[PDB]
Amino acid sequence: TNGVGYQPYRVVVLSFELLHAPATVCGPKKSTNLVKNKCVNFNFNGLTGT
Amino acid sequence: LQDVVNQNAQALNTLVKQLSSNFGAISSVLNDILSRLDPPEAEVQIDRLI
């Protein structure tokens, strides 16, 4: 009978550390094949660069 | 003669090392700021870096 103000709410909070450690939880992505001796833009587990 | 070389090398080194400071932003890596944050909010950090 209580109003929405006092109706219980269920809360889940996420805390994300993004410092470049041996990261283990990644997003859904497809790992392509690597190339050598060419200037390319790469992404190794979040270590983006060119 | 060695003093000139040492002074120039030290100035160049501190110029390089000033690229690793947050300057009040959320990170010192500009690509990291772009990837983690939406364009409207990224400009606030980018301006401090600039």
Added chain:
Amino acid sequence: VYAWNRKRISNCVADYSVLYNSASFSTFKCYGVSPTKLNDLCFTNVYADS
């Protein structure tokens, strides 16, 4: 409220897109990251408090 079961989400491929797309959740507020880019990033040390 006084307690909370912190859960370790590690070593798996988190999708993160199924969430924030359904209307079941009343609020989806993110601070360090923009919610829409939780897929490209690879995270470390996920904390979940319920």
